[PDB]
Write a protein that binds this ligand. Structure first.
Ligand SMILES: N#Cc1cnn2c(Nc3ccc4c(c3)CC(=O)N4)cc(Cl)nc12
Ligand SMILES: N#Cc1cnn2c(Nc3ccc4c(c3)CC(=O)N4)cc(Cl)nc12
Ligand SMILES: [Cl-]
Ligand SMILES: [Cl-]
Lengths: 4, 123, 123, 4
């Protein structure tokens, strides 16, 4: 999971 | 403020390809000369300007069988259909002209681009 | 010896979400209490262990309407349905418990994982 | 395009  | 799962789109596509291999929920047969290819209309539209136009048509949207132009090569179509479902393009010296002509007909601009670049490098 | 187009899977998913927004080729309504959500069965199966089980069932595969357990929260379902079609999860303090419970029911392991990690960090 |  990432900060887009 | 959303978070994003990097591999999600690839995982979705992998499962759409598994559905295609098992012939689950396929709703169209694409006929290319003597060959038939089962697929999902939604995936075809998502990948191809030609299928996007065909399946948004109020009459063609309901067809279970679509016949492509007799000049279209079945192997070229097969390679592009595999690309649609996997992101992988089996581009070879022996098939590049057929792949490029099929991608132009199917309106798959990114495939056309790369075929053009690979041909330019060989001349 | 294939080449691969990096953005292809993301581009496919973006067009599947456009089809959903325009209600094109959607083949199921998911009923969550008083709310209804139209979707594509193939995308639901590709994202969820629950829908994969439901739509491979020889009887349920043909249903146009699927009713979820009355304990399922419509907002939680809406957030997860948006995630399925975009890879983006709108996870907030006010919705995390409902999102996690819905993801457990839908069998969306990666969403469950992250909800667990976000809850563990707040305690 | 890349070599996967
Ligand atoms: N709704 C919808 C929807 C489903 N599919 N789709 C598009 N599919 C498409 C149209 C043109 C081209 C390609 C894909 C690849 C290419 O080279 N050209 C576009 C839009 Cl703007 N919308 C949609
Ligand atoms: N054919 C086919 C096919 C279509 N969909 N699909 C799967 N969908 C799925 C099953 C379980 C789970 C998820 C997705 C996300 C998750 O957390 N669990 C799996 C397989 Cl092995 N195959 C398929
Ligand atoms: Cl393309
Ligand atoms: Cl997930």
């Amino acid at each position: 999971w990432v900060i887009p | 403020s959303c978070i994003q799962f990097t591999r999600h789109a690839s995982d979705v596509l992998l499962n759409l390809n598994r559905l295609r291999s098992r012939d689950i929920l396929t709703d169209v047969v694409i006929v290319v000369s003597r060959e038939q290819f089962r697929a999902h209309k939604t995936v075809l539209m998502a990948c191809s300007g030609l299928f996007y136009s065909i399946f948004t048509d109020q009459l063609k949207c309901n067809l279970s069988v679509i016949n492509l132009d007799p000049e279209i090569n079945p192997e070229g179509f097969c390679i592009l259909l595999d690309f649609m479902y996997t992101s992988r393009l089996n581009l070879r010296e022996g098939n590049i002209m057929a792949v490029m002509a099929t991608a132009m007909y199917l309106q798959m601009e990114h495939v056309v681009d790369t075929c053009r670049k690979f041909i330019k490098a060989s001349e």
